Design a protein around this ligand. Structure first.
Ligand SMILES: Nc1nc2c(ncn2[C@@H]2O[C@H](COP(=O)(O)OP(=O)(O)OP(=O)(O)O)[C@@H](O)[C@H]2O)c(=O)[nH]1
Ligand SMILES: O=P(O)(O)O[C@H]1[C@H](O)[C@@H](OP(=O)(O)O)[C@H](OP(=O)(O)O)[C@@H](OP(=O)(O)O)[C@H]1O
Ligand SMILES: [Mg+2]
Length: 520
């Protein structure tokens, strides 16, 4: 182009809104219809909503029936307009029912069925005057036809009615008199030859493969220290906001754990539809995040805010609503920030560059509840804290006996584990933490450990196992852990099992001592 002017194409955003509206409708018809109206994709009149449902493009027909059956004044009007879009003139009652029953699936509730079939019968009689002496006659015969369809075509009904049985069953239905024999015979024969074809409701799959996502879409984002704008594909899921360079990427460019953040609308002189992620309680403090460098190594973010531009005000509103709903809120996060800041030493920079001290990159992994975060902050803050499950990661640098340990504590919940591999690059020591009282999950821990250490990026890492929770009754001892984690086989790697109690601190310094002694 020569000018990198950021322009998105209307086709992208409009098709996305169309797809969004349909998705919403299929979950909740009232909410989908409201979304489409707000997004100027549907007009608000009963007639306009009726045309939308009648076309029913990509709409669940059971959901259409649910909505049309409702007692609401608006819904009643939609229903009448819906039946008016059906042309029943010059069709017999079976043929008219075939048509109508293609357009929606009958709801289960008797009062809803009645409203819809009354509306149908009224429409049929207006289209075909003189055929039936009343709407009631038409309505009742419609159900005689439906019952016939069941009797003839459902194998659970043993005795199949003949034409003559169907004719005589309907004696007197025409306001006391009989309908024409040949009319009833024609209806019978039509149903006998072809059952009602019913649109059975389907299910569709998802486009991408990542974690089940709350929202995804393209946004422009401003850099941290270097204030440059980049187009990124964002995925919001499981209390984390991820971003990628391309939809085809299979690893994130950035990860933002949504811990005690807030959202504000901002005005920007050059980009439209902007909002910011920020921490209201710690103004000016760096937001926890990580991003990938050219060589694949994950590093900490430098943002005090995340300014983001959406391609439309509608998508801005969607993203703000979604992100707000996905924020993990908890005093724990404020507790960590406050305690860290108190013992924050500015001098550490001027001393770290002077001692020019080398250090050690650590990846700390293990099943959820193993004790990882407790260990991290026991080391970082010199105290045992009451933790909550980690949705993304925690990262802290700890100085211990002349070595600076950069420790990445990654969440161990099921859903997060496929992401562990992301953090491998650059790892010099693995800390694998195990709950020694959890015999139900020790084999699972073994499986995870070996997947990690067999990875091409983890071949050189020394391995420290924290055999944690030694304070608990009947907790597995280090020798049992050695066996149960299958470490005895592995004779070509440098590993050690350190007994620990993270809550008292027992064994933690001993583990860090081992790391320093064995790192080459
Ligand atoms: N009895 C006992 N409990 C511990 C010990 N260490 C940690 N815990 C407790 O175990 C629970 C989980 O500990 P966490 O540090 O949050 O575990 P985690 O590995 O970070 O879990 P994720 O964040 O899901 O990955 C918490 O209630 C801790 O207080 C220990 O040595 N003994
Ligand atoms: O691409 P250039 O112009 O060099 O600038 C980069 C990008 O804006 C990065 O965004 P992305 O990671 O999406 O590529 C950003 O990382 P963030 O992802 O943390 O915003 C960097 O922030 P700093 O490293 O803070 O300067 C910034 O230096
Ligand atoms: Mg944790």
């Amino acid at each position: 182009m020569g000018h990198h002017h950021h322009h998105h194409g209307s086709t992208t955003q409009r098709n996305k809104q169309i797809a969004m509206g349909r998705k919403k409708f299929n979950m909740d018809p009232k909410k989908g219809i409201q979304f489409l109206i707000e997004n100027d994709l549907l007009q608000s009149s009963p007639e306009d909503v009726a045309q939308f449902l009648y076309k029913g493009e990509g709409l669940n027909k059971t959901v259409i029936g649910d909505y049309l059956g409702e007692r609401d004044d608006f819904n009643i009007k939609v229903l009448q307009a819906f039946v008016e879009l059906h042309e029943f003139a010059d069709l017999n009652l079976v043929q008219a029912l075939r048509q109508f029953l293609w357009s929606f699936r009958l709801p289960g509730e008797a009062q809803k069925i009645d409203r819809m079939m009354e509306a149908f019968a009224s429409r049929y009689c207006l289209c075909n005057p003189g055929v039936f002496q009343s709407t009631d006659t038409c309505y009742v015969l419609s159900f005689a036809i439906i019952m016939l369809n069941t009797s003839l075509h459902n194998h659970n009904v043993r005795d199949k009615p003949t034409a003559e049985r169907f004719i005589t069953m309907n004696r007197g239905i025409n306001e006391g008199g009989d309908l024409p024999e040949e009319l009833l015979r024609n209806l019978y024969e039509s149903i006998k030859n072809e059952p009602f074809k019913i649109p059975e409701d389907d299910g569709n799959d998802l486009t991408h493969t990542f974690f089940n996502p709350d929202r995804e879409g393209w946004l422009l984002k401003l850099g941290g220290r270097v204030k440059t704008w980049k187009r990124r594909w964002f995925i919001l899921t499981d209390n984390c906001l991820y971003y990628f360079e391309y939809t085809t990427d299979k690893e994130p460019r950035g990860i933002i754990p949504l811990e005690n953040l807030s959202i504000r609308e901002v005005e920007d002189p050059r980009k439209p539809n902007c909002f910011e992620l920020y921490n209201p309680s710690h103004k000016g403090q760096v937001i926890k995040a990580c991003k990938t460098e050219a060589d694949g190594r994950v590093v900490e973010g430098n943002h005090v805010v995340y300014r983001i531009s959406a391609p439309s005000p509608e998508e801005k509103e969607e993203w703000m609503k979604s992100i707000k709903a996905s924020i993990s809120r908890d005093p724990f996060y404020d507790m960590l920030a406050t305690r860290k800041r108190r013992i924050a030493n500015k001098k550490g920079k001027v001393l770290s560059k002077i001692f020019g001290n080398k250090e050690m990159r650590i990846l700390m992994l293990g099943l959820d509840a193993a004790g990882k975060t407790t260990i991290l902050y026991k080391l970082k803050l010199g105290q045992s804290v009451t933790t909550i499950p980690t949705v993304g990661f925690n990262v802290e640098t700890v100085t211990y006996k002349n070595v600076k340990f950069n420790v990445w504590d990654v969440g161990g919940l099921d859903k997060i584990r496929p992401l562990w591999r992301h953090y491998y690059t650059g790892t010099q020591g693995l800390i694998f933490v195990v709950d020694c009282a959890d015999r139900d999950r020790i084999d699972e821990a073994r499986q995870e450990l070996h997947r990690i250490i067999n990875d091409r990026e983890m071949r050189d890492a020394i391995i420290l196992i924290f055999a944690n929770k030694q304070d608990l009754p009947d907790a597995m001892k280090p020798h049992e852990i050695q066996e149960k984690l299958g470490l005895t086989r592995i004779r070509d790697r440098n590993w050690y099992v350190q007994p620990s109690c993270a809550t008292s601190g027992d064994g933690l310094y001993e583990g860090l001592t081992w790391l320093t002694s064995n790192y080459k």
